[PDB]
Enzyme design. Structure first.
Site, short mmCIF file in Angstrom:
data_model
loop_
_atom_site.label_atom_id
_atom_site.label_comp_id
_atom_site.label_asym_id
_atom_site.label_seq_id
_atom_site.Cartn_x
_atom_site.Cartn_y
_atom_site.Cartn_z
CE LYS A 152 -78.10 20.39 13.31
NZ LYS A 152 -76.69 19.96 13.57
CE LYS A 161 -76.39 21.12 25.08
NZ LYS A 161 -75.04 20.66 25.56
CE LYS A 196 -73.37 12.23 20.50
NZ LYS A 196 -73.26 13.58 21.12
CB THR A 224 -69.44 26.18 23.77
OG1 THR A 224 -69.79 25.28 22.71
CG2 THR A 224 -69.80 25.56 25.13
CG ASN A 241 -63.80 25.58 21.90
OD1 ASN A 241 -64.98 25.49 22.24
ND2 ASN A 241 -63.43 26.25 20.83
CB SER A 246 -75.30 23.66 15.68
OG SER A 246 -76.35 22.90 15.11
N1 NAD Z 1 -67.69 23.59 22.64
C1 NAD Z 1 -68.10 22.31 22.64
O1 NAD Z 1 -67.89 21.55 21.68
C2 NAD Z 1 -68.84 21.80 23.85
C3 NAD Z 1 -70.36 21.72 23.74
C4 NAD Z 1 -70.84 20.59 24.59
C5 NAD Z 1 -70.29 20.52 25.91
N2 NAD Z 1 -68.92 20.97 26.16
C6 NAD Z 1 -68.13 20.02 27.03
O2 NAD Z 1 -67.04 20.74 27.65
C7 NAD Z 1 -65.92 19.80 27.95
C8 NAD Z 1 -64.63 20.40 27.50
O3 NAD Z 1 -64.76 20.88 26.12
P1 NAD Z 1 -63.63 21.86 25.51
O4 NAD Z 1 -63.98 22.18 24.11
O5 NAD Z 1 -63.18 22.96 26.43
O6 NAD Z 1 -62.44 20.76 25.51
P2 NAD Z 1 -60.91 20.88 25.28
O7 NAD Z 1 -60.43 19.48 25.11
O8 NAD Z 1 -60.65 21.90 24.23
O9 NAD Z 1 -60.34 21.52 26.61
C9 NAD Z 1 -60.46 20.89 27.92
C10 NAD Z 1 -59.33 21.43 28.76
O10 NAD Z 1 -59.49 20.80 30.08
C11 NAD Z 1 -58.19 20.71 30.63
N3 NAD Z 1 -58.27 19.81 31.78
C12 NAD Z 1 -58.47 18.44 31.91
N4 NAD Z 1 -58.47 18.01 33.17
C13 NAD Z 1 -58.27 19.09 33.94
C14 NAD Z 1 -58.16 19.27 35.41
N5 NAD Z 1 -58.27 18.27 36.26
N6 NAD Z 1 -57.95 20.58 35.82
C15 NAD Z 1 -57.83 21.64 35.01
N7 NAD Z 1 -57.92 21.52 33.62
C16 NAD Z 1 -58.13 20.24 33.11
C17 NAD Z 1 -57.31 20.17 29.47
O11 NAD Z 1 -55.96 20.12 29.69
C18 NAD Z 1 -57.87 21.03 28.32
O12 NAD Z 1 -57.06 22.24 28.07
C19 NAD Z 1 -66.31 18.46 27.26
O13 NAD Z 1 -66.81 17.54 28.25
C20 NAD Z 1 -67.43 18.83 26.29
O14 NAD Z 1 -68.29 17.75 25.99
C21 NAD Z 1 -68.20 21.45 24.98
#
Ligand code: NAD
Ligand code: NAD
Ligand code: NAD
Ligand code: NAD
Lengths: 418, 418, 418, 418
Positions: free
Chosen positions: D66, D90, D102, D186, D217, D351
């Site tokens: 996966k 994970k 991956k 998430t 998100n 997932s």
């Molecule tokens: N839901 C998922 O897909 C998921 C699962 C694995 C891990 N996480 C990890 O979480 C992280 C973010 O994912 P997401 O879906 O929220 O991304 P996203 O791109 O939707 O949102 C990230 C947000 O961070 C903000 N940001 C960036 N730098 C910043 C700072 N210095 N201060 C304050 N805000 C800041 C951006 O402006 C943005 O709104 C990634 O590294 C991702 O790998 C997410």
């Protein structure tokens, strides 16, 4: 051909009782397909050795073939073919979508090292592979084999197919796509079976006497879940003696002693808990109890001792404890016995559930599993009852044989086989 | 079980002469895989009967399992397992990339109705289907089976795969991907082998006199092809007597009257072509001929009559015509006997040629087929001879069993089986 | 990566000569598929180890992939990708319906016990199994591998499919569905190639002094078959020295004492024959012969010794024996150098025949096989010759490569790839 | 390779802290299979281009592989292999029967058109097709990919199998056998983890103050559900600034205004809510709160700011927000940090739920989906926590890794892989 005759008589007897055409008996007395093989293994210490094994796929109608494989030095086809037929009547009576098979290998596992054993196991699975599969034939553990031997087989089959095939074998380790409830599946099943019997005879098992024989893997857990339902386990015999208690023995000790063997677990009720230790495995019989549960071995409630029986309800936990002669004797005094075929079928039902979980790659929790396991059991009893009550001279045994024999006949007819 | 015990001893005798490890014998003594099946057939009168059938697959190494199926009542696995063993060595000796198998079905075809037979054949094929294919196990006809039966099994298998599979069964009608040569396949081989042996002994065959016993499918065709190679067929016999002609019998009549039964062929050689006649089918042993070819029944040359054989060369067209005792008797007299496992292999080899043709959907002409058959045979006669002349106190028979046994031994070695 | 950067330009050169589009170069640049696996072996003399292996699959247009597998500790992906690319061109030029691939397992086979090597070999076949097959990708032996390793692989793959798959690996034991003619396939081919060229430059090889460098596998049989065509070998070198004899070296001795290593062979020419011995393997270069054949190693004719070359015609029996700078010089002196991709393709061609035989489970005699091999080679040298003379300034090298880039190109177009 | 060496070391520690044999590290260190492929695409007005892509299948023991597929130009194998190893751990920690894999394709989707991007996406699914499937390898979205792309791959795969195979790709459109809950998976999981971690430390999240970093998100939906559990979101930040309000930010603005980007949602809190708004985003590191959640980027809490956070509980929303050094600090300061591998595993878990539904062709409702999703996460937390206390000196992350290595190691042993 010895044991075989018995079965051929057990089924033939049922047929006459259900008024079934001789043609039905025909297609039942002969296994659908049998695969014999010789697995060549190179002993880590020595030279060569080829073991003869086989798989008996008796009947298909209700669903895929289901049955365990034996690793014993004194095995023969006829016995397994005979056993396979029994496995077909069991699943049918259990209300499962399973057929009935049975495999074996002529070898003494206590003569092989871990390397040689795993070597044989992988060899046997790789040999019969072209004829098994998660939806065609799901082997299981038996006598010589165990969860560990199954695991190796599951892995061997998986490498052949090139992907993980969990449902091809059942009763595998919890770490290898297995369900924990398998530990007390048969017990919990025996308890539910009897609890339902009382609800129809006395009105409920609550506050009733219980005399269990054999604190092995069946009796042990049959006493635990029995009290959790409202029974009073006053006696729990074994090779050594017995453990009496008019207030009811503390079975909760079994949860914290699931590895305290059977014999020692009998002493525990004497050493730790305060119970009367009457050194004698022939006391639980005459003992004044509501329900007697022979969960030890076969040939226990014979005719020479059938008189001693005081219990008005006998739930056969062990395999074939009450002899046919006794079956009659006991029935003519009030004592009623519940067909072991029905009562200890919780094991197969459990393998069924494990299997179903494997197909959708999803494991349920203990509570979840226990409920379905119980539900089926509860529904299997309600079925045999109606038949048993709608006939005179018919014993539970006969009711169960026909009920099972009737499901198979029904399927075959609709399917256009006879 | 007595025949099996006989085949195993036969194999041991060879395992020693060749000097192979006992581990080798361990792998060959037991079949690789056996599939016992029960196929239910709906008779015309009444409506139900389940038949016993199976398919023994002995050894792979040289290529896919090959072997005919027997439809006979007095059939037992043991004997059939033995045949599959002999079928394995025979294929090895023939130089074919074939394994060795043998199937059977306990039933008397002369008791079933045309319809019932087809129903049985298709049931046998459909039951063993998962374990056979044009590259895994190619069955063929035997005692109770014929070309018509092969046809019903080819069609059945093909309606299961969803397309045409002509190579899954050999010896099928010419009108259904067969090869006309099958008619005289074996006889043409016996003739080719006898000629070769004649060369490496007398320098040439022609002028040499030949006496064939039995004007069946093997004998009548041997006497015909042998005259084409220079021989002089001066005597032929059958159940009705013997036909003698010093000038030599006119074999052309055989081709102009094939299917003219066997005994009618004898009288034919008397009516049309002038030939002496004696009302004694055992006179062929007395005849002072250079070559004698037993192509009828086994145990025809016993120790109680071996001393009456004048012939200096004996080529076995039938199976087991020379008793182990008569073999020695004659041998220490200078009379060499060519083994049947080598001489009558023309039928097994022909089936190979048919199979190869089916895989490429191309059928060669009769001259092409004949030349490939003659080639293989000749080469086989060479391999046995060279070895026969290397050791001492070795009979042709010995040379074959070892030569065939050695090709399987080496195969298993390179493959990592032993 | 230096060898790969080399091959990429080697090809780019041909692209610009033939005037093919750049889109063509793009697709032939990167391999279509690359499978990297890690096989865990349980060192008998120890505990554990995880070997790295892979199988490069370059181009499939002409037909199924065909390349060898290397067991060497200094093997890197890039080199094999480059080897794959060359293999595709070589197979194209050879006029076979093969796509050319490559594989390797980083390890020192001469450091693993027999039991370890088999286990490793079997694991490599098992790992890449999902991406190979008698009609998708047929491996073969190479540096660290051999016919025995090929056997274990075929075996393994066969216990995976469930039946015998010969055509999956070529260059296998003659006893395991292989072909003997493979012993001298390459040599014979080089022999036929030089014979054809002499027929277009001098009108016949009859009575032409030849000098063969190396008496391994290629040179060994190149010298032997060369005489049978009318040429006459006067010199043959090796690590030990050079065997001279203006009258003609008795090459028949090569067949009499084959498998007598390289250096020993040169001595035999000094013992049994009256050849003159010279302690220096560089003498052949200085010799004034008509046909020189480098069959030992690469970088044998560099830009520092090209002038010393006296032979008017050069036929490469080894891989890259003539250096680029030297090829240039050797050419502005009237000396034509026949490319290795065309001359030593006798090996790939022989692998194609064995394969074609396995697909029909029919093995041809050494005669039939030899004659077929010869045929393919002749039309190859012929095809490559016509284009060579058609252009001006072009070297056999150019004509060879361009002819290859053309057959692949025309295929991609007709299929709709470019 | 730097990140690879980093991840390899990250796992080296766990092997030690858990006391596993080096053999375990051996096999776990190298990826089982690696398929590299080159997909040729025909640009629109352009011409040709061959894009490189690959799939890393690390370890298939707990179930089918996966992992996600990336579409980024600065992609390299090693990094993807490294990420695959993380996925393997994970998935184990998540208690899912998932392997770890991956994918990646070196390209900048923001350069290609929809037609080209589609052709590239389908060619990728087509190239690796032979090595994936609903029970073998289930790819998923990642950096340069999304549901739209998965949809195209699912379709391309389904036209290859000849029927619809929905369970081969996850995170696909709701209209295409997907599940809505994926939208806040998430964030909901992060919310559930912290709520469970609170109970162990204090006794409930009700009343506790929460500070989130980034309203993307993850953070966005973490804040929404967190409040529903009794939390009090007083600080939400982003690139645009911060939004404070001790009373508690009304999260209802999120669901109603879902899909309003990160920063915009922040202003919305300053407009439709009397919350303060400081330009400097680093302010979030000053607000004294019970809980802090970094859900934006990596390298957020380093060694230079570690000693400033007031939160007694930090939950990793983003990947690697806490610097190894800062982890040392925060811990020896009484601050417990919840491992991201455990905290944000909510999306991987969901997932799995989408997959299960695809195998049974049944889609549950949001309530059903969330109950199972919540349960799993709660159970994962317990497991880690319980083992964390059993040892001293260990950190949440420390126990998390070992908890993961244990499930894998155990399965490998029972399987005979070690
Ligand atoms: N839901 C998922 O897909 C998921 C699962 C694995 C891990 N996480 C990890 O979480 C992280 C973010 O994912 P997401 O879906 O929220 O991304 P996203 O791109 O939707 O949102 C990230 C947000 O961070 C903000 N940001 C960036 N730098 C910043 C700072 N210095 N201060 C304050 N805000 C800041 C951006 O402006 C943005 O709104 C990634 O590294 C991702 O790998 C997410
Ligand atoms: N769970 C299952 O494997 C299963 C399912 C099918 C049917 N049942 C049947 O139940 C029976 C026992 O199975 P188990 O798993 O409990 O076995 P077990 O081996 O765990 O225990 C048997 C117990 O019987 C006791 N015992 C032996 N002789 C005795 C005697 N004369 N009196 C009293 N006790 C005696 C032993 O000391 C032992 O503790 C068998 O006939 C078996 O076929 C079991
Ligand atoms: N082509 C084959 O089918 C084949 C291949 C394997 C071995 N052989 C063996 O050859 C033998 C004959 O096979 P066939 O196919 O020719 O059979 P067939 O039935 O065509 O002919 C046998 C002939 O033997 C004659 N016969 C019986 N007893 C005799 C006696 N005492 N004297 C003279 N003639 C006598 C019969 O009358 C008959 O014409 C069998 O043992 C068979 O297994 C045949
Ligand atoms: N037959 C094939 O498998 C095959 C097919 C592809 C191409 N060719 C190429 O031909 C070359 C030789 O292969 P082979 O199988 O004949 O090898 P081999 O190992 O059988 O023999 C090589 C011989 O070269 C001799 N040698 C080494 N250095 C020498 C030097 N400086 N002077 C003179 N002799 C020297 C050795 O002593 C040895 O006898 C290789 O480059 C190979 O790739 C061979």
């Amino acid at each position: 051909t010895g044991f075989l005759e018995y079965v051929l008589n057990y089924v033939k007897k049922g047929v006459e009782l259900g008024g079934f055409p001789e043609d039905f008996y025909k297609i039942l007395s002969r296994p659908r397909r049998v695969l014999i093989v010789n697995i060549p293994v190179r002993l880590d210490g020595g030279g060569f050795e080829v073991f003869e094994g086989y798989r008996v796929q008796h009947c298909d109608v209700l669903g895929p073939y289901k049955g365990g494989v034996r690793f014993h030095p004194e095995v023969t086809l006829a016995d397994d073919v005979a056993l396979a037929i029994l496995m077909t009547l069991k699943n049918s009576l259990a209300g499962l979508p399973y057929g009935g098979a049975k495999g074996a290998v002529r070898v003494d596992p206590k003569k092989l090292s871990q390397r040689e054993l795993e070597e044989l196991s992988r060899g046997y699975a790789r040999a019969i592979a072209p004829l098994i599969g998660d939806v065609v034939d799901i082997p299981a553990p038996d006598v010589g084999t165990n969860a560990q031997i199954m695991a190796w087989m599951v892995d061997e089959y998986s490498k052949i197919k090139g992907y993980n095939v969990p449902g091809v074998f059942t009763s595998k380790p919890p770490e290898l796509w297995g369900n924990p409830v398998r530990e007390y599946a048969t017990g919990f099943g025996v308890a539910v079976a009897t609890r339902e019997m009382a609800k129809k005879l006395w009105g409920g098992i609550e506050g009733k006497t219980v005399a269990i024989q054999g604190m092995g893997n069946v009796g042990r857990w049959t006493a635990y879940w029995l009290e959790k339902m409202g029974a009073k386990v006053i006696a729990v015999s074994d090779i050594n003696g017995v453990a009496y208690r008019k207030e009811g023995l503390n079975v909760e000790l079994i949860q914290k002693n699931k590895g305290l063997t059977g014999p020692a677990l009998v002493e525990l009720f004497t050493t730790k808990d305060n119970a009367e230790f009457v050194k004698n495995p022939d006391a639980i019989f005459k003992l004044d109890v509501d329900i007697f549960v022979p969960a030890a071995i076969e040939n226990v409630i014979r005719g020479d001792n059938a008189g001693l029986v005081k219990a008005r309800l006998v739930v056969e936990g062990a395999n074939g404890p009450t002899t046919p002669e006794a079956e009659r004797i006991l029935y003519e005094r009030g004592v009623v016995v519940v067909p072991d075929i029905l009562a200890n079928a919780g094991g197969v039902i459990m393998s069924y559930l494990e299997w179903v979980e494997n197909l959708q790659w999803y494991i349920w929790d203990e509570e979840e599993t226990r409920k379905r396991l119980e539900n089926i059991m509860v529904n299997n009893v309600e079925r045999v009852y109606k038949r048993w009550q709608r006939e005179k001279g018919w014993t539970m045994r006969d009711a169960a044989i026909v009920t099972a024999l009737e499901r198979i006949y029904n399927a075959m007819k609709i399917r256009g086989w006879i």
